Amino acid sequence: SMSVKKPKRDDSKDLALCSMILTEMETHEDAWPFLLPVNLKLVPGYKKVIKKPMDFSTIREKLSSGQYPNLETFALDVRLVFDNCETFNEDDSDIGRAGHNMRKYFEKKWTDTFKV
Numbered sequence: 001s002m003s004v005k006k007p008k009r010d011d012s013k014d015l016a017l018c019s020m021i022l023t024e025m026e027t028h029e030d031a032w033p034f035l036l037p038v039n040l041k042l043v044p045g046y047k048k049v050i051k052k053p054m055d056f057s058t059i060r061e062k063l064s065s066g067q068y069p070n071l072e073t074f075a076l077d078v079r080l081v082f083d084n085c086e087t088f089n090e091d092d093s094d095i096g097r098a099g100h101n102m103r104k105y106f107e108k109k110w111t112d113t114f115k116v
């Protein structure tokens with residue numbers, strides 16, 4: 001509360017650590033469905049069904065331009081890429097499998113870096 005804080009966490013490396021994490025996502029073999037915005041002209045249903053499209057290049061533009069105020073906001077956009085993927089793709093498809101694989105990959109790094 002007012003004049004009563006928890007001990008200050010060093011948050012000065014978070015930008016760099018999120019960039020590193022995102023670079024590891026971008027270069028994974030199964031990232032290809034997520035690297036660019038889905039082409040809303042070319043994919044029927046996407047625009048109406050997916051209320052908040054998201055992708056790695058958009059995440060990278062946001063991060064590099066100071067648009068995440070904190071860690072939580074960066075991890076919300078990352079998860080949204082996979083939440084979207086699940087909403088739109090069957091689990092038993094190449095892209096649905098990529099999505100599951102990339103979330104797992106993300107969450108491990110996310111825990112190793114900021115939890116453990």
Ligand SMILES: CC(=O)c1cc(-c2ccccn2)c2cc(N3CCOCC3)ccn12
Pocket residue numbers: 032033034038042043085088089095
């Ligand atoms: C993320 C997602 O749902 C997605 C990502 C792709 C994609 C990204 C890069 C290159 C090729 N495909 C894609 C492609 C889709 N289609 C391919 C063309 O036929 C219509 C469906 C449907 C959904 N998607």
